[PDB]
Symmetry: C3
Subunit: 216 residues, 3 copies
Amino acid sequence: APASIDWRKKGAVTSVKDQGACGMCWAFGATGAIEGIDAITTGRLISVSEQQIVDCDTGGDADDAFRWVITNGGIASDANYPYTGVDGTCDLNKPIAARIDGYTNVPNSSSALLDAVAKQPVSVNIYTSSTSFQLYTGPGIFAGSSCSDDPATVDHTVLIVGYGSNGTNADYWIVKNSWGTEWGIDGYILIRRNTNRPDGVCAIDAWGSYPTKSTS
Amino acid sequence: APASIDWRKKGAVTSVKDQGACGMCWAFGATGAIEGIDAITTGRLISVSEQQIVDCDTGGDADDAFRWVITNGGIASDANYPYTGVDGTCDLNKPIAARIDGYTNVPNSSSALLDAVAKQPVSVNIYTSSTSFQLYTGPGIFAGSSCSDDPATVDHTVLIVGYGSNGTNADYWIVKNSWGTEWGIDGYILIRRNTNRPDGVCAIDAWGSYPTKSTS
Amino acid sequence: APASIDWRKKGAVTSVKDQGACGMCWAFGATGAIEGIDAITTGRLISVSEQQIVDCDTGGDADDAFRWVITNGGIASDANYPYTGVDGTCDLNKPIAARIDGYTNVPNSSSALLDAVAKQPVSVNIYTSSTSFQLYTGPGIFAGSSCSDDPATVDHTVLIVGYGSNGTNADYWIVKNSWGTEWGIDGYILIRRNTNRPDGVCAIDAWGSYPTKSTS
Ligand code: NA
Ligand code: NA
Ligand code: NA
Ligand code: NA
Ligand code: NA
Ligand code: NA
């Protein structure tokens, strides 16, 4: 894999979304992974409907979202099926913006996650209950010294959009959250990589997956 | 800014439209500016519905069009909501092709307009009542010696898609009209720039604006 | 024209489709040509609805498909109007994914077909009733020694997506079929070009055509 990548510079990442204090909004993180593969394969960078997955498939993880989009034969755009944050009536008669064919799980191994992110944006499940995570505003790498790294205690899907290094002891992941641009660094967090925590900071390397699509 | 730009060569300009002798068709000029920012930011070059703005928001200027598209949460494609030239029933249940978030006014200063066109296609309001403008067919730069340059007497929105220079006394703007390809140079006019008329030929530099969009 | 081209490497070819044992499915081959010009001109690589042409226009050749899409003012996506293989109720109230303006017939001359494929994917009509064609799995060039080359006996539209040469006596066309990826070389056939058969192997050079679109 390359020494660094940033899918935001490669036209595969949509704007940061703000879920608010939602009643049911578990599919962000998966939605950006669909957006990434749709952009790479079809030349189209379009936000997809996190709300349609929630309304038509309800908690859940990224693979539950991928499975629903595959079963439905696609997903509507966020513009045609907007976000409310609360579970409402499922509408299936909406235009399709993106379609995927499968999904792949990444093993709990930092090297395998790096390889996957070199290919496309990857959804991951992380622990987010520490106040230090909640209050992260940058400007630098998040060390997560109070994060729980137990894979069993993760609670939130986010999207890895890249990685790189600022020097020894400063390898990182670039992670898109859905908490709006008044969180992190314009809505992103730079999470330390290549630490002595085998499951990764906040268990980031335990639960990676990404959607796949048939092409010519 | 660069010495020249032509957004038609950069994949940000759709075909020239023909408004005919319309009853109500004031939103061309604004529509191409939306198309430009949608292409630049999403990788998609799609004509948008000038008719939907007219039906759902009726005269008006480009900012009235931008304001309506922002308020509606987007605009349909011209293919899904075709042009008739006459005000008809507003249809809001149509797929969304483009969405924008804001708009910016350019000061009445040629340098600020040049900077804006180096960034994206820009809508401008011009005076168009001189027979010389009506009968322009090229093949060269339009000098507009009979044009009125009073900002108060402009009457039509068009779209600046580029600029350049053919030598001293031959600086120009590249302007897309909506009068079909049997006007101008395949529907465009090359309007002299950097003259001694402070508001510009036909007041072109008085009323520039352009739509903006949130990105990753 | 260049010595070789492969539109699959240039972002203009969608996944291979599988028509199955259809009751009515004559528009594949034309559909990929629309997809090609839509990708080249609009930056969008999207499968279009072969089923909508069949439902709304029924046999036929590629020009019948082009004529229907022009008359309808566009064609829906395959995602919004899925394939069944059997003629059913025509639905015209579906979002438009692609629009074209005209079509051009290629003369029965290999050089003119090469020039057309250097410009975009081209639909062609071929004879497909020989068991050797049916059972082609590669891995090399199809010589078609049992193919009928009579233009009057062609029976199926396919799509030329490129051409090249592997040496003297090994010039070829790259042809996308709609028989799924368990036919040919992942759904494609490499048909010998520049033979002593004037109408081409399986009459491939007799009936080329392609759709055209107005642009800026
Ligand atoms: Na599911
Ligand atoms: Na809802
Ligand atoms: Na308005
Ligand atoms: Na109307
Ligand atoms: Na027809
Ligand atoms: Na049908």
